[PDB]
Design a protein around this ligand. Structure first.
Ligand code: XE
Ligand code: XE
Ligand code: XE
Ligand code: XE
Length: 263
């Protein structure tokens, strides 16, 4: 809806920073709304969904097993690792790592998962081979959040990430079990409270993943819909702003409210 587009435009001027927006019809892939859809934004933690997509593809192929246990050391723990810092002795299964990476945005979890697939370049190769020749991961946590202006490292575009998320969740790539697992992790997201979820009426479904990084970067990817079933994909990024986290949150929440009101 155009008034949602207005909220996006106003957010861009008010934050003094680029904002990218895509609204995708989940069933048909038809685009309902878009703003700067072919511009690059740092992915930040929204990449962790793509990461566990790659992991799940290896599970399907039998190259990985969800119950395989990984041990690591204290030296592996980078900033913000709320789950992995609790399992230095017992270790964590691959399933637990993806749960940590997506639901809690655990950074060390993401790094360990990256190692299982061969690093950022191999995540990019995975994306490439599923039809996304735009999105690229280059670095690890936390350096991938640097958000240097016009840097293309660790970026996606509104349109590329929307289509890739749609393919991961509903496309032929993953098995039904793996699609369901992925969406289940995103539905269990615990660190995107004040964003799209804030605009959500009771009874609605949402599966999402948010991100924040340097230089005012903020973003969220989501599959959502009324009556407990998702029907749209929404991708929203911004970078460059000097705004507080709280205002960036509120701007996203306001776009979300428009999205709902004009659903
Ligand atoms: Xe979905
Ligand atoms: Xe935003
Ligand atoms: Xe929303
Ligand atoms: Xe949003």
């Amino acid at each position: 809806h155009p008034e949602t587009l207005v909220k996006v435009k106003d957010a861009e001027d008010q934050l003094g920073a680029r904002v990218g927006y895509i609204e995708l019809d989940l069933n048909s892939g038809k685009i309902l709304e878009s703003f700067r859809p072919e511009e690059r934004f740092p992915m930040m933690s929204t990449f962790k969904v793509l990461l566990c997509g790659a992991v799940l593809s290896r599970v399907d192929a039998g190259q990985e097993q969800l119950g395989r246990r990984i041990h690591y050391s204290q030296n592996d723990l980078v900033e913000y690792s709320p789950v992995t810092e609790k399992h230095l002795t017992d270790g964590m299964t691959v399933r637990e790592l993806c749960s940590a990476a997506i639901t809690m945005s655990d950074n060390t979890a993401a790094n360990l998962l990256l190692t299982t697939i061969g690093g950022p370049k191999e995540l990019t190769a995975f994306l490439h081979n599923m039809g996304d020749h735009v999105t690229r991961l280059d670095r690890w946590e936390p350096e991938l959040n640097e958000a240097i202006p016009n840097d293309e490292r660790d970026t996606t575009t509104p349109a590329a990430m929307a289509t890739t998320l749609r393919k991961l969740l509903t496309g032929e790539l993953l098995t039904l079990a793996s699609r369901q697992q992925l969406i289940d992790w995103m539905e269990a997201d615990k660190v995107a409270g004040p964003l799209l979820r804030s605009a959500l009426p009771a009874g609605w479904f949402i599966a999402d993943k948010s991100g924040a990084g340097e230089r005012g970067s903020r973003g969220i990817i989501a599959a959502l819909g009324p009556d407990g079933k998702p029907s749209r994909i929404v991708v929203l990024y911004t970078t460059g702003s000097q705004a507080t986290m709280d205002e960036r949150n509120r701007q996203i929440a306001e776009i979300g409210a428009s999205l709902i009101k004009h659903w």
